[PDB]
Amino acid sequence: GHMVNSFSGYLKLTDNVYIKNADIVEEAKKVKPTVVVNAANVYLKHGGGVAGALNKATNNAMQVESDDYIATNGPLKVGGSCVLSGHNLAKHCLHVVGPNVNKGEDIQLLKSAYENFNQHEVLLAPLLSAGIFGADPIHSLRVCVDTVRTNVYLAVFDKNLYDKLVSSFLEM
Numbered sequence: 001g002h003m004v005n006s007f008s009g010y011l012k013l014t015d016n017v018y019i020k021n022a023d024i025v026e027e028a029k030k031v032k033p034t035v036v037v038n039a040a041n042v043y044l045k046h047g048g049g050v051a052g053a054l055n056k057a058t059n060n061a062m063q064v065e066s067d068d069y070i071a072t073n074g075p076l077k078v079g080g081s082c083v084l085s086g087h088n089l090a091k092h093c094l095h096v097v098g099p100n101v102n103k104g105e106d107i108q109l110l111k112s113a114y115e116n117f118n119q120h121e122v123l124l125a126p127l128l129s130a131g132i133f134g135a136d137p138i139h140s141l142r143v144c145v146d147t148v149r150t151n152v153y154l155a156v157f158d159k160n161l162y163d164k165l166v167s168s169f170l171e172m
């Protein structure tokens with residue numbers, strides 16, 4: 001049978017949102033998901049954070065394909081997305097651009113970002129904008145839970161952040 005989208009060890013937060021303390025790259029190898037989400041910039045230049053880890057795991061294939069896409073089509077809009085190959089990690093990678101709060105981009109665009117998730121049944125995803133782009137992780141989670149109606153399995157790398165998110169959620 002197909003052991004595709006074989007998620008295990010997630011906490012169910014809502015009907016359609018699950019969360020786990022895991023490296024999204026390790027989850028990708030284990031699950032072989034249809035879609036993995038990248039927390040991208042508009043240039044798909046995969047730096048630190050999730051983007052760099054995903055790219056490193058593809059031996060730079062993601063960056064080469066991303067360079068090609070951007071050469072052809074130009075940059076994404078903040079809040080926008082594109083579907084590219086998941087290479088050796090997944091069938092597809094949904095590249096989504098959260099607002100860069102560190103450069104004072106409108107936090108409103110984080111709702112636009114998560115809206116992209118609704119075009120896909122099942123996603124393995126991180127918290128958009130909550131790392132290098134300097135949004136409050138609890139805010140990213142709230143906007144995710146409030147916006148996404150499809151099945152999202154969130155991977156949080158940092159144990160302490162995972163614990164703060166889960167406690168903060170289960171108080172309301």
Ligand SMILES: Nc1ncnc2c1ncn2[C@@H]1O[C@H](COP(=O)(O)OP(=O)(O)OC[C@H]2O[C@@H](O)[C@H](O)[C@@H]2O)[C@@H](O)[C@H]1O
Nearest residue numbers: 023024039041046047048049050051129130131132133157
């Ligand atoms: N390997 C990982 N697995 C799971 N979660 C991770 C991982 N690495 C980081 N995280 C967490 O995922 C969330 C997203 O952080 P970033 O990946 O930095 O995303 P973002 O804030 O949107 O920054 C995007 C920017 O950073 C670059 O990676 C990217 O090219 C873009 O310029 C944060 O909570 C971060 O701690």
